[PDB]
TrEMBL record, chain A:
One Gene Ontology term of the molecular function aspect: large conductance calcium-activated potassium channel activity
Recorded topology in the membrane: Multi-pass membrane protein
Residues the record lists as binding Ca(2+) 2: 222, 574, 577, 580, 582
Keyword Lipid biosynthesis among record annotations: no
Descriptive protein name: BK channel
Organism: Aplysia californica
Intrachain S-S bonds: 390-403
Residues holding Mg(2+): 112, 147, 172
Subcellular location: Cell membrane
Family: Belongs to the potassium channel family. Calcium-activated (TC 1.A.1.3) subfamily. Slo sub-subfamily.
TM stretches of this protein: 8-29, 50-70, 76-96
GO biological process: modulation of chemical synaptic transmission; response to xenobiotic stimulus
Record flagged with keyword tRNA-binding: no
Length: 741, 405
């Protein structure tokens, strides 16, 4: 069935046939004698002995047990030696290349019933697969048996081969491609649980890579039309092409993980509340809480929070017909659980509308699904077994188990909007930028070339312009970077108000003096240049240089400038801070930059491919928390190619104008200042929830107590949902899911 | 601890296991006989002899001391020959590539106490390293033991390999990169004297190369925060990025050698005074004064000047409270030394302000440092031992040594 097999069998048959005929010839001549001596030297030599001797001399061994005594026998022996030597000298290379032609990664995939498996394809590559493997095969998982069956074109790398071998009990590999139905039959997609599609986040043409990924999705849906597919996309505008696929059903499980949208939304939410990027980068990623005596108090307190995850559970019968604030404060005070959001639209028409910290109007219906923040699934299981009577006063929650019965908005009304204007309508020089008293704004140091791939700055400014912010509450975003790249980005950026542009490199200190950076509320540092074609450690040279330059400036607070560098290669995070004194082999988290919200790596998005498979509602919760709501109808509107459009929207669509946003509050002053005076976290949580409808996610706390002697820096780390009795320093800040400003 | 080592041990274990089991099989069949002849051809053959014969025939040697006499023994011998030949024909290429995978430049750097070493990295390349090696390892140096421990990514070139071998007593080489803390631990940067960073002076994008060099400096300062680093830069505007590094202390030794600035400044100073480029290109470079009868008068007179260098010495007690012109003309007329400049700002606030040929207003303070032009360090040592009385009229400057206070 194979041409190479035909060639190999032809060679082996020729070899054995010549061997046999030479054996017969030598046997005849040796047993006959020599006509030179009139056949007087013939010896009784059995044919099988001649076969033995012939193969012995073919292998260049020559035992000497059997040998040619006849003169002509010796001559034929020598002649066969020349013939054999020439035959091999001519035929070895093709034998070697036939042996090398054997593909080491072919063959189908065989699994036993009850063992789910997930097909992964697209951009299988060591860096792109390492993070997804860390999250998917992370050690303290509720490890239901699941095998990652890869399907890539080329050979794996040496380090990728090591990854394959070290996880060989779970991870496999198969040469092939998505666009071959035989290949999809090999990996048994017909009985697969899901089929993830990774992407090359650093490709030179994001549109072409997105189109290729969508083509792979088309192939998968053509082969099997009811398989859940998780897709990694590079651009937000390419997220509507998946809606064209007739087998792409969002309600059935298929989701798109947009790299640009999610990354820039994480950064924008960090802009609204500093350090909120690493709060959700740890909320939706498997992390291990393994405290050690080496780690200090702050580091252990942060590592306790990073090990806490988000889970989905059905509210027990007790929560039925109860308002959301009461249910959440009961889950915290009584059940010691943090209830973020609830699916609520199951009332009238359709499910899957995640009300996040809804107002007291929303009531808990029967068997509604709620999202909790908890250490593991066993802790969130308590929310399903709580009852009115049998757990009314049961302390030690371990025992609560198994009861015995003039502003223009976008048409969607989600984002602020302005009529399309040319680039020069907001383009400014250093004189104009300095003239404008920018305060509490957001500076975006964008390292891009004239032809560098588009990254979609829209996804950075879109969450900054949510309709739940008052117009005076809008942070004036200003972008310092290349001017041609901003010409390309302005087609999408023109519809957001209070935007501004300052051309020129952001490393230029004169620009940062012009756009007041000592006064900016956040200084994003994004690099749109084409990298990862150079040394991996030199990939983020420009971002690290910009961060150090901004931290080294002086004004009339160089290190007090809040900036969030985004890292293409996570290993560079060590260079973001010098006083960290952390080991180079430490993972991305647990490092002072990432743990403080100053750094952010794209690799986190790779881990989002794992959770979005394990938790179906993870991605839709992330997007609601991040992108200002990003209603599906909005990307239907953007799918029409007309761009973001809308005018003075009616109050009917403005009803969703006051939704739940994430912000920060300070315990230094305000109605909640008393809890900073040695109070406990649970008291603050219950009081805020009962009095303002404010859901305290977690804490943003100084790395060391800000006494100018312990640590004279303004460095803060994030603690995700600290325990009930956590002490509250007066300088601590609180992440809140505030509603109605 | 290594996947390649695991593969190699698996192959060798498989080979030895098949060898042993084939030896046992052949021993059994040879000592049992042949059922075709009702086991009448069995021979007393010890198992170790069978092991010997089997390895002899595996190596394609075939001494003939031991051999298969049984017919079925001979058949098994031939069958094992086919199996062995196919096994090698299938398994040689991976053995060869495993043997070739052995990096020839790994391993850490080990040095004995008291032996300073200098780490060099960046753009290690024959042309870029040859001149630095000529100056650093130049023959008539005050050769305090110092080893140049290179740290580059790729393999050295053939000529670079020759440079490594000919200076192997001092020069070493190590595969790796600056941006790996394990690599910096290998070359013992924690106890290194300095860490030079060469650059590619002819790269197509000087800004990117300068940024890469500054990134390497950032890595070095992150690993060890108090190590002197000498950096080769291509642009003058990239010389300010090194000030952003919190561990970059100019007063502590870290310097930036800007290629463009220094080269074009040499040329500009030649513009002001012709031939001044080669005056300082020889003032600040180790050159040997080895006159030969072949060279003419002008050539020998120039080779005498090229061997003269610049040194730093503390002015002796005699020069204290004395004006610069008098001190310099005394160092020339009396001590036969050329005093160029003096560090003078040590008076009020901070050192390191080199007054070059200052006016008579500047006076020599106590224990000030002065820069001399002299053949070698022993000649400039006279500036430290000159005294008012004991060397007032002492001619033959060889005798101006170690005054008795
Ligand atoms: Ba956990
Ligand atoms: Ba560090
Ligand atoms: Ba000399």
């Amino acid at each position: 069935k194979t041409s190479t097999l035909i060639r190999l069998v032809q060679l082996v048959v020729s070899f054995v046939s010549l061997w046999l005929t030479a054996a017969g010839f030598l046997h005849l001549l040796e047993n006959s004698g020599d006509p030179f001596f009139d056949f007087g030297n013939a010896q009784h030599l059995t044919y099988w002995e001649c076969l033995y001797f012939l193969m012995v001399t073919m292998s260049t061994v020559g035992f000497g047990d059997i040998f040619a005594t006849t003169v002509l026998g010796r001559t034929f022996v020598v002649i066969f030696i020349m013939i054999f030597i020439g035959l091999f000298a001519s035929f070895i290379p093709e034998i070697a290349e036939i042996l090398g032609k054997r593909q080491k990664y072919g063959g189908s995939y065989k699994k036993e019933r009850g063992k789910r498996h997930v097909v992964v394809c697209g951009y299988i590559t060591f860096d792109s697969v390492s993070n997804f493997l860390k999250d998917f095969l992370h050690k303290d998982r509720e490890d239901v048996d699941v095998e990652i069956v890869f399907l890539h074109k080329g050979l794996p790398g040496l380090e990728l081969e090591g990854l394959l071998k070290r996880h060989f009990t779970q991870v496999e590999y198969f040469w092939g491609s998505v666009m071959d139905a035989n290949d999809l039959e090999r990996v048994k997609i017909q009985e697969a649980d899901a089929c993830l599609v990774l992407a090359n986040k650093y490709c030179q043409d994001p549109d072409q890579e997105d189109a290729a990924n969508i083509m792979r999705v088309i192939s998968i849906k053509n082969y099997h039309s009811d398989i859940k597919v998780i897709v990694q996309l590079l651009q937000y505008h390419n997220k509507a092409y998946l809606l064209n696929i007739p087998s792409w059903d969002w309600k059935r499980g298929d989701d798109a993980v947009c790299v640009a949208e999610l990354k820039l939304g994480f950064i924008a939410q960090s802009c609204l509340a500093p350090g909120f990027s690493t709060l959700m980068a740890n909320l939706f990623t498997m992390r291990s809480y393994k405290p050690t005596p080496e780690m200090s108090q702050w580091q252990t307190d942060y590592m306790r929070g990073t090990g806490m995850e988000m889970y989905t559970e059905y509210l027990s019968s007790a929560f039925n017909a109860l308002t959301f604030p009461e249910a959440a404060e009961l889950c915290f005070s009584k059940l010691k659980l943090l209830l973020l959001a609830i699916e609520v639209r199951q009332e009238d028409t359709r499910e899957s509308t995640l009300a996040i910290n809804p107002g007291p109007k929303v009531k808990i219906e029967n068997a509604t699904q709620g999202f909790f923040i908890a250490e593991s699934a066993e802790e969130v299981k308590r929310a399903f077994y709580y009852c009115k009577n049998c757990h009314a006063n049961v302390s030690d929650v371990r025992q609560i188990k198994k009861c015995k019965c003039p502003r223009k908005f976008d048409s969607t009304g989600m984002f602020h909007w302005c009529p399309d204007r040319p680039l020069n309508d907001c383009l400014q020089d250093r004189s104009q930028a300095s003239a404008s008293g920018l305060r509490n704004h957001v500076v975006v140091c964008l390292f891009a070339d004239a032809a560098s791939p588009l990254i979609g700055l829209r996804n950075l400014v879109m969450p900054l312009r949510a309709s739940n912010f008052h117009y005076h509450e809008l942070k004036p975003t200003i972008i310092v970077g290349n001017l041609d790249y901003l010409h390309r980005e302005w087609k999408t950026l023109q519809n957001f108000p209070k935007l501004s542009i300052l051309p020129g490199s952001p490393l230029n200190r004169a620009n940062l003096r012009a756009v007041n950076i000592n006064l900016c509320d956040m200084c994003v540092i994004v690099s749109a240049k084409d990298r990862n074609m150079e040394d991996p450690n030199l990939v983020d040279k420009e971002a690290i240089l910009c961060s150090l330059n901004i931290k080294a400036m002086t004004f009339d607070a160089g290190a007090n400038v809040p900036l969030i560098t985004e890292l293409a290669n996570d290993s560079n995070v060590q260079f973001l801070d010098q006083d960290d004194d952390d080991d180079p082999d430490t993972e991305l988290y647990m490092t002072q930059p990432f743990a403080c919200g100053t750094a952010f790596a794209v690799s986190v998005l790779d881990s989002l491919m794992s959770t979005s498979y394990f938790n179906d509602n993870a991605l839709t919760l992330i997007r609601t928390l991040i992108t200002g709501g990003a209603t599906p109808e909005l990307e239907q509107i953007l799918a029409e190619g007309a761009g973001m459009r809308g005018g003075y929207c009616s109050p009917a669509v403005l009803a969703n104008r006051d939704r739940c946003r994430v912000a920060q509050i300070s315990l230094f002053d305000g109605p909640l200042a008393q809890f900073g005076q040695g109070g406990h976290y649970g008291e603050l949580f219950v009081y805020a929830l009962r009095h303002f409808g404010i859901l305290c996610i977690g804490l943003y706390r100084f790395r060391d107590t800000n006494e100018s002697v312990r640590s004279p820096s303004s460095k803060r780390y994030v603690i995700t949902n600290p325990p009930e009795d956590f002490p509250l320093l007066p300088t601590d800040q609180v992440y809140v899911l505030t509603y109605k400003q």
